[PDB]
Amino acid sequence: PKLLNRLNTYVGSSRVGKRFKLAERNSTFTTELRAGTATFLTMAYILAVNASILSDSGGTCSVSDCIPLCSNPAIEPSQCTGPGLRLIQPDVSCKFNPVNPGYAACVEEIRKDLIVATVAASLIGCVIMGLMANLPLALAPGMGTNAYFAYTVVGFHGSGSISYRTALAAVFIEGLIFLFISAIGFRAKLAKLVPKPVRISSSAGIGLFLAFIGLQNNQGIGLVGYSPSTLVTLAACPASSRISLAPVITSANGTVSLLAGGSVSGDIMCIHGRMESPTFWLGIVGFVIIAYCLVKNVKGAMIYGIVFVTAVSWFRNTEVTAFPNTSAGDAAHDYFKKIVDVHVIKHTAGALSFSGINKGHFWEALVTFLYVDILDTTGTLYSMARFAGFVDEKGDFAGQYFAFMSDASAIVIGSLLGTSPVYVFIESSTGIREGGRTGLTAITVAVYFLLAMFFTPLLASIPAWAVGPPLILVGVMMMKSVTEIDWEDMREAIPAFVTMILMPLTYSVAYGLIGGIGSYVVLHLWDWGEEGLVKLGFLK
Amino acid sequence: PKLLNRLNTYVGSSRVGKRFKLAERNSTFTTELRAGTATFLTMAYILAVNASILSDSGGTCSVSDCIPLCSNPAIEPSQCTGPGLRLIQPDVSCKFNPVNPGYAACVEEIRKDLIVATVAASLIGCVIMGLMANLPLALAPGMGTNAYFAYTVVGFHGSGSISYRTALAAVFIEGLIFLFISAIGFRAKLAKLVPKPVRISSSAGIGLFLAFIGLQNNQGIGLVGYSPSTLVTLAACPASSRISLAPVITSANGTVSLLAGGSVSGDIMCIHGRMESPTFWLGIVGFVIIAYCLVKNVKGAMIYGIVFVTAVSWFRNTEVTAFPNTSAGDAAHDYFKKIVDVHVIKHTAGALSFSGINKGHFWEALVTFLYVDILDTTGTLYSMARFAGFVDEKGDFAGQYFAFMSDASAIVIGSLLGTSPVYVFIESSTGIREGGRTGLTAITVAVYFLLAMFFTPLLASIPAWAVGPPLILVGVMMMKSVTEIDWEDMREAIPAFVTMILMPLTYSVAYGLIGGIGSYVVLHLWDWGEEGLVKLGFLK
Ligand SMILES: *[C@@H]1O[C@H](CO)[C@@H](O[C@@H]2O[C@H](CO)[C@@H](O)[C@H](O)[C@H]2NC(C)=O)[C@H](O)[C@H]1NC(C)=O
Numbered sequence A, B: 001p002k003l004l005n006r007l008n009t010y011v012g013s014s015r016v017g018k019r020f021k022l023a024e025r026n027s028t029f030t031t032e033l034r035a036g037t038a039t040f041l042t043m044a045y046i047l048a049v050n051a052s053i054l055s056d057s058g059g060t061c062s063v064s065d066c067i068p069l070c071s072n073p074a075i076e077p078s079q080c081t082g083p084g085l086r087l088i089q090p091d092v093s094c095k096f097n098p099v100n101p102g103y104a105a106c107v108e109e110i111r112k113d114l115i116v117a118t119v120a121a122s123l124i125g126c127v128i129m130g131l132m133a134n135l136p137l138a139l140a141p142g143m144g145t146n147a148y149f150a151y152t153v154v155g156f157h158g159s160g161s162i163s164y165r166t167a168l169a170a171v172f173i174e175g176l177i178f179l180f181i182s183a184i185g186f187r188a189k190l191a192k193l194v195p196k197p198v199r200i201s202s203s204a205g206i207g208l209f210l211a212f213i214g215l216q217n218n219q220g221i222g223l224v225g226y227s228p229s230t231l232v233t234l235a236a237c238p239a240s241s242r243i244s245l246a247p248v249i250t251s252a253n254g255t256v257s258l259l260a261g262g263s264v265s266g267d268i269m270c271i272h273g274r275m276e277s278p279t280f281w282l283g284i285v286g287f288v289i290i291a292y293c294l295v296k297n298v299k300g301a302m303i304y305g306i307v308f309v310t311a312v313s314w315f316r317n318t319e320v321t322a323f324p325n326t327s328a329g330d331a332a333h334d335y336f337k338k339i340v341d342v343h344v345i346k347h348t349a350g351a352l353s354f355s356g357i358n359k360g361h362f363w364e365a366l367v368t369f370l371y372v373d374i375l376d377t378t379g380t381l382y383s384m385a386r387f388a389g390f391v392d393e394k395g396d397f398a399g400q401y402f403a404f405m406s407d408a409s410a411i412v413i414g415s416l417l418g419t420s421p422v423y424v425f426i427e428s429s430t431g432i433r434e435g436g437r438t439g440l441t442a443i444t445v446a447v448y449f450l451l452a453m454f455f456t457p458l459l460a461s462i463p464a465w466a467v468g469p470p471l472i473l474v475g476v477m478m479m480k481s482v483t484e485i486d487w488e489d490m491r492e493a494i495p496a497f498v499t500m501i502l503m504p505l506t507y508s509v510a511y512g513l514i515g516g517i518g519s520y521v522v523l524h525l526w527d528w529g530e531e532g533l534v535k536l537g538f539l540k
């Protein structure tokens, strides 16, 4: 007949085809390849978004990486010898605005390491899922968990309460816990520990958090900036018209300023020219492109928007350039010039540290990882199984046990490589829509991720306004869970609203979950006491 | 029979009963009184929330009422005569932190005016609806437009782009516009001008906006404070541990500070003691009290939470006191000590000013008032008519012509008295449930508002953490509109999400609507262009 059908029959009748059970699942070899291609197309925006978001965390960079700076900017530090001229030893302020050039270079190196680590963790998770579990599920570091890890647990440039190494240790312990509770088979049981309204509204809260991240300056398009009174107003004026903030002291006459050692912000307050920053408008154009491609059911909408914005930003001498005429910009362009590069992780791999176990914030972060990973994993696996028709009358899909162990092992490996916990994604459904039924789809996605290596220079040149609109639209897609919340019932509307609004407003998934669980418990205390008295018999 | 039944039969056969059509609507006199009481109880939280929010707008006064301050705080301004000692002329910074004692005298005096103006607008609006339209609809300044008028159009202490007097002129003209388009009868027709996702998600966006205000410091319980990096984190540390911010200049060596004339913020940045401010915990207790009463279907849930928090804050020497041991706090207690007082509006009444018509921000606010009021009034009235069974097969409720013209007339009067536009509340549905059918219910609510006067001292003593949880819980109830947004459709999910999220993030209803309408128009340009070519005939 045709060469394509000959290939399909040869693969299906071979040992590898029988091992993957292609015949018993009615999926051919090329069907699995097409499903993997579609899954990678709908998933590959991670290679930009997750790597950049983890890059904001600062990685393993510390104050030791900041170089001493001369008294005046006009003299290079080696020539900083003269009257009234001295070199300033770095402090904790070296990490934040104005960022020490040494710390910035360390952050770029960490960005390359984290691109490679994210790709490697996704590859290893996909391979484990395809081989050990034999399911068309593609694994990659999660969106909300990654954002929580970077901006809340470790914070921007390590401003959080837990260091990056200790957060990696938390992720590793979380993976070990999942391995333990999935070897027994209790993950389905712990999928009911959390309250229902919290369970549904956590996704919408995480989506709002991601959209708010995408509406900021350091990794979004702008449009949300500091306000002295209202605390948040319309940003997206040009970067030349943005100024920093430092804490001050007020008195009954005038504002005698400068609390010494105060943490100066970035460039968040807009002085004039609102709605005029070209980077924000380029982000809006990419947003429109992604939105149209999502409306038209075009696979890779996120990819097309990111690529368009990044390619416009790759030009050297524009206002939207990703390589400004600076030493750091010149280095970024020099690294981007070599299109293909094989990068070896040097700082992030094996960067675990169990020193901060005793701290309360460590356990808060670990419990948050447990809760969020449980919700995402149990929801997505059963949604996928319903998509693929693997759900029987009992409600299981045969390989669920190995699927959960694969996810836990992939989380452990990602922690060892130095990334946020890795999930099966909802976009895996795309492959299932394309006919993907066996683990060969995961193998194909892993091969695509492998080819996504040797392209670190193209992935490290993706600007913030390119990361940008993908976050907003990911939040839009996550928002759809609000439909099955009974907003008429206050016992369910109040905890759900509280969770959903605290995640973006406290800027913390942990704080949103804690607030929602506390509100649920408080609002149901009366009912639980009534039921306890009824069981005891004081009431009828 | 009974004296109660004798009263019902006497009025029903009287001229007043026949004019109100009690017999033809099967509602008795006491039924309207119970309905009016239930409507007032369900909506009485405006007497706390409304006046407080408009008070933050700064009212009518300006830097002219800030008093000159001595060089040092330790010397009273009259005794400010000595070597190196001088009186500081007030500037625009007198209005903001640290607030000039002269300007702080306004807000207390303006708050008393805005308590009466809120009641008088509510009283007159209820009477006109009760008499001219004969419907059980209670009119009061809207919750969402209140916050937009105070915090966005005029801004906190007049920091916005439009002065309070000009914003009143916007409301007056905006009131005239409906009076014109309701006399013709087109207000039903303009209910379709807005896109469907924008109309539905505007309520949820406003609810997020209102809950966002309830989580701030100047009008809420706290728990949301400034962050140097993330721009929002967990506030609600004690007020002694909050510090201000002033814009600064960064260089390549160090942050040489103080952009001269920069707008110093309030007390938004928390240094330590997070989750330890007693005022926030008092608000949470009030939040729990309202939530349980809302759950238990207890009428007046908002008031009980407001009253309990306000009553605890009335004690003089606690950490949650509403009258701190200051000169302003002593004056607040002195005015509170006289329980009953008849207040005459002296600054706010008739404070219109058409000087700023030519400015663009004036028309942005006026059109935003026009849009917001169209969605609120048309949606509420038909929901009320469905509740009261006044909707015929044609979909009208007979007295709709005067119902819209009554609402327009009340808005004009409210602007003259100096409040935000007044609407029929959704809480008007409450009295309809107990049997409110004629305009006598509105008269009864009007009488209660009359009794709400002579209690300005008790209403001007309501602290920010008492306003607080009602705003959060009003945001919860407004959030129920999300259920009829097709979140599967990106042509509706994206504009709805954008509309919903910009209102609390840009912290502006106008920006949320402009973004949502712009996103709706852009995302439908391809479809409209396709159908335009189909009508022309280039396509099939
Ligand atoms: C860092 O370099 C700046 C110059 O940009 C220095 O700024 C000083 O502070 C203000 C702002 O310019 C001026 O009034 C001073 O004259 C500046 N000093 C000098 C010598 O020009 C600042 O001195 C430098 N900071 C440190 C710690 O050396």
Ligand SMILES: *[C@@H]1O[C@H](CO)[C@@H](O[C@@H]2O[C@H](CO)[C@@H](O)[C@H](O)[C@H]2NC(C)=O)[C@H](O)[C@H]1NC(C)=O
Residues within 6 Å of the ligand: A251, A253, A254, A256, B070, B071, B072, B073
């Ligand atoms: C305003 O009040 C302060 C006291 O709170 C006055 O004293 C100044 O305080 C700052 C530090 O808080 C010192 O750096 C200044 O040297 C102090 N000034 C003097 C003369 O001692 C301050 O003088 C007052 N400022 C104005 C403009 O009146």
